[PDB]
Design an enzyme around this catalytic site. Sequence first.
Site, PDB file in Angstrom:
ATOM      1  N   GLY A  79      28.847  36.046  34.166  1.00 17.16           N
ATOM      2  CA  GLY A  79      29.521  37.370  34.592  1.00 17.16           C
ATOM      3  C   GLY A  79      29.000  38.441  33.943  1.00 17.16           C
TER       4      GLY A  79
ATOM      5  CB  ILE B  80      33.050  34.407  37.990  1.00 15.51           C
ATOM      6  CG1 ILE B  80      32.044  33.850  37.166  1.00 15.51           C
ATOM      7  CG2 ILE B  80      32.743  34.709  39.319  1.00 15.51           C
ATOM      8  CD1 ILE B  80      31.312  32.493  37.602  1.00 15.51           C
TER       9      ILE B  80
ATOM     10  CE  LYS C   7      41.145  37.353  37.210  1.00 16.14           C
ATOM     11  NZ  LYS C   7      40.169  36.747  36.618  1.00 16.14           N
TER      12      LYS C   7
ATOM     13  CB  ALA D 200      39.250  40.096  46.138  1.00 18.51           C
TER      14      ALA D 200
ATOM     15  CE1 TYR E  43      43.371  42.564  38.860  1.00 16.16           C
ATOM     16  CE2 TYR E  43      45.067  41.014  38.861  1.00 16.16           C
ATOM     17  CZ  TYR E  43      43.966  41.251  38.670  1.00 16.16           C
ATOM     18  OH  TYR E  43      43.098  40.417  37.754  1.00 16.16           O
TER      19      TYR E  43
ATOM     20  CB  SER F 224      29.432  42.636  31.921  1.00 14.29           C
ATOM     21  OG  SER F 224      28.860  43.081  33.262  1.00 14.29           O
TER      22      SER F 224
END
Lengths: 228, 252, 233, 254
Positions: free
Chosen positions: C12, C91, C162, C94, C155, C18
């Site tokens: 990731g 990671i 999640k 969408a 979200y 990041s």
Amino acid sequence: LLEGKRALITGVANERSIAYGIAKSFHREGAQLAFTYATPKLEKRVREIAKGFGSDLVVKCDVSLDEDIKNLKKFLEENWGSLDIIVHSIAYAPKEEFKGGVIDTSREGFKIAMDISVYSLIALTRELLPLMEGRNGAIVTLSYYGAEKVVPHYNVMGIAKAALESTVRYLAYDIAKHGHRINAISAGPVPITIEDVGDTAVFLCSDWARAITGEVVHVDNGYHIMGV
Amino acid sequence: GLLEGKRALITGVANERSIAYGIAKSFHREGAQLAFTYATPKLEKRVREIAKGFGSDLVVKCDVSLDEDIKNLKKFLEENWGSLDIIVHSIAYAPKEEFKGGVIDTSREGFKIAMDISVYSLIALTRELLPLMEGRNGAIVTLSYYGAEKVVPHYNVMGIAKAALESTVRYLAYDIAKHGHRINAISAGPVKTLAATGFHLLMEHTTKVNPFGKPITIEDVGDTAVFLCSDWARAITGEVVHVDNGYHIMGV
Amino acid sequence: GLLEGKRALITGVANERSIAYGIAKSFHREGAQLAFTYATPKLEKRVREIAKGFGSDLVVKCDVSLDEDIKNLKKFLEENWGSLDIIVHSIAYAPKEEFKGGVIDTSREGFKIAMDISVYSLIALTRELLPLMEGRNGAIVTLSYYGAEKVVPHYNVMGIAKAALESTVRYLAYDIAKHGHRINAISAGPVKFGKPITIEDVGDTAVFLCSDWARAITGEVVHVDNGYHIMGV
Amino acid sequence: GLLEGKRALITGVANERSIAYGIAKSFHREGAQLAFTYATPKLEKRVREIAKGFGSDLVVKCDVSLDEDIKNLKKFLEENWGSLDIIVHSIAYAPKEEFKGGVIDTSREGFKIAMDISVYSLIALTRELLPLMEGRNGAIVTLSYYGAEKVVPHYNVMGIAKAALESTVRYLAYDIAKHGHRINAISAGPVKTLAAITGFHLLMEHTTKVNPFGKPITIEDVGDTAVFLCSDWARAITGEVVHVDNGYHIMGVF
């Protein structure tokens, strides 16, 4: 629907009490009612309210007193001889406790909050369970979102309500052996109405909810879901 | 008569042991008008027979993996009702292989199917059918399981799906509130259904551990669904209600 | 330092902002040897540059939507290390369209993609790489967000992903404990009282959770959010 | 060490099996200076010897049911340190009788004692000692148990107490954040301690069989977690409950 059911209602102070909304819904659904009043100064109003629902069964009960709890059992033994439902709507901390934060809570104020708002449920449940024998009874209590998240100024009551919801779980385990259920309604500020609570209480205290115990049901217009 | 004058779509009836059958039974008792989906051509006969038993003539094929089947479901309800009060979402599937080992052994394709059928279908149905609910005090109910919250061995990818489902319920509650509608989940305990590796042992263990020492029935779910889809629950949305004889309380 | 002699795979990293970069930074400070995936060819250069700055030349392309990329990652680690201690799973994706409107507006394909990349990738990496961890008492850490638990408007499908991810962590904890390994999630607040956190906050928490100090912690979600989660406002 | 130059108050040491002893051990390894309370006069010798072992000469009697003992604790720390970084709150008690039946059998007095000692003590200590933490990046850690969240038979009134404790942690996090401080709970699994009761052996056995590692936690597991949570690495973590339980909390079958 509560036809043939006998319910004790605690916590009626006036017509805006959450317990009044519960008593109103219970009456509509065919329950016979008995009432406690917390202090002598509340006796007149509670008697009038009970009469308005066709009840003459009113008894003084300070839940901080063991003797008052035993006297309540005796009063119900004498007038009914059995019991189906307990509605527990009793929560209190001295007003000073709501100033500042939890960090400012006094020891005595903490003791009082826990004893009145939480222990009273244990004492009522223990004392009145024999009256429920073979009835498949139901108990309902009141909580608030401040049990699970910080609601500023709710303070010690947020601690008390967290303890209360845990108490509901343990009591559910205890009383299932005798065929009974106990649940909590986590009410939004009364915004919902006292009737929202009452209709939810009827369901939870009815045989339709026979598979529901140790549960906390949010009656709060969805407030609990929000993360912002 | 808590649901007098209410129109309810019942998904997920396969036979008389289905959780959705229990819901239909309680809804019928309480005065709801019913319509049913059936998932596969093989189920048509018995679902039609079940509907008939409740006084319903409204049965339609709907494979929720198909966008066109969801669109045709809407078209069917538009023609036969033209308004809708309640959606009962009782749809859950993963290929049976996915239950054999642990979540670590889940196949990519099995995962995709499980999430699509068991979770996405709620979003598709809610979006498609919401217009038919306009002006109504709508209620949606879906079914979940404790495997969403804790590890139930062999429930596997379905425990992942149900956790996603409960989150989906919360977000949908937020979306549909501005249209005057509500959505909740019933977290039901195990029931011996056609749909439901290790089932016997799960059922036995759950029965032994819950404070009542007995499983729930489809009627327990149905009576709870009535309440949650009635105007008595007007202040209840985005909620997960355990209908499990207290199993959820145990920390053993 | 806490991670001395430990070998960690970091997924990731896209750039120095990041969340995985902060984890790699804390991991490096604490003595871990590092290997990196890059998601797409256009990220190869930056990831190799980042790895080099940490003293690593172990960089491999891995699109987690592809079974063959995951198998190939195992081979790359088998060849260069032959064992593994830690997986950092950072990671989540969408299509951008999915964050417009509410969950009600989620497309089927967008939903499938979100779940596959954000959730299933963890299962596939854990399954494939577990043999490399044999006899090491390994640790896996993934990232989550409060939108899994409560509604955070916009979200959307990621809140669903999640919630699924956190459940996946529980089930995987059950699976991998019999091999001596642990897996936990960090629920991070928004990134750089209830204020934005830094990638360093995540990194130092990741070090602890992936260290032997956390040997008794598994299937847990730890909030690194300056206390945001407590508020009922 | 992660706690170099930090000063930590350790409450709840009775002997070397105490959870607070594990915490002291980890804190010492990591460079913390330590001070200890002892609950009753009979524990004084034991706790002084344990402190000595860690290079500490700071031991003071503190019965948390007493406001005056909490005041004197503050006075003791003002005289011997004059600043404070960490409070370890490892205090839980209910009369033995309360564990015998179910919560339904809880006595009013036993309930009051349990809540006072196990919950209110955290508020008292936090309020009284917060000034000593001024200008420091303080951290407080308390101990909880899964009985706060679910029914553990015979844990009884302590499950009520621990649920209140976890709520208390949330509210205190809110209160103390504006002073630059954090507070968290470790929800520890069962450990055979002096303090740990009806059905303990069976609880311990059952927990060990059910948790994904098939073994209990140790006081050192708690200690190492406490170090992290009370260090500046956890600067972004407050009002949190961390399970240190070998995964027991994940299980939905038993």
